[PDB]
């Protein structure tokens, strides 16, 4: 390096820093990925149960 025009310097390298990023959820494998073909998805649901039986 050169300080001004007639003087020299000592160069000590560079310092770098990056921000944090969290990855807790990705480590839990909690989601399942599907690859479709269009921008519409359909889901179907079914319910069932039981009932009473009165005396006869």
């Amino acid at each position: 390096m050169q300080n001004g025009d007639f003087q020299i310097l000592d160069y000590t390298g560079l310092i770098s820093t990056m921000p944090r990023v969290d990855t807790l959820l990705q480590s839990m494998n909690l989601f399942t990925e599907h690859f479709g073909r269009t921008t519409v998805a359909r889901i179907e649901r079914l319910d069932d149960g039981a009932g009473d039986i009165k005396a006869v």
């Binding site: 025009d5 007639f6 003087q7 020299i8």
Partner: protein
């Protein structure tokens, strides 16, 4: 005229002189302050040197 007084001759001249001589000194010094942080001309990003200034 013949038979009369004679004629006489003179002599030469001499001289002496003395002279002195002058004296001419010259001197310059060097110091650390002029060679520490200065950058040698003609080069770039190189440090100065004491020998170059002596020459």
């Amino acid at each position: 005229q013949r038979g009369g007084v004679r004629q006489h001759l003179a002599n030469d001249r001499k001289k002496i002189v003395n002279l002195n001589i002058p004296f001419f000194p010259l001197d310059r010094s060097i110091d650390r302050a002029d060679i520490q942080n200065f950058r040698e001309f003609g080069t770039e990003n190189a440090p100065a040197t004491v020998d170059a200034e002596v020459q």
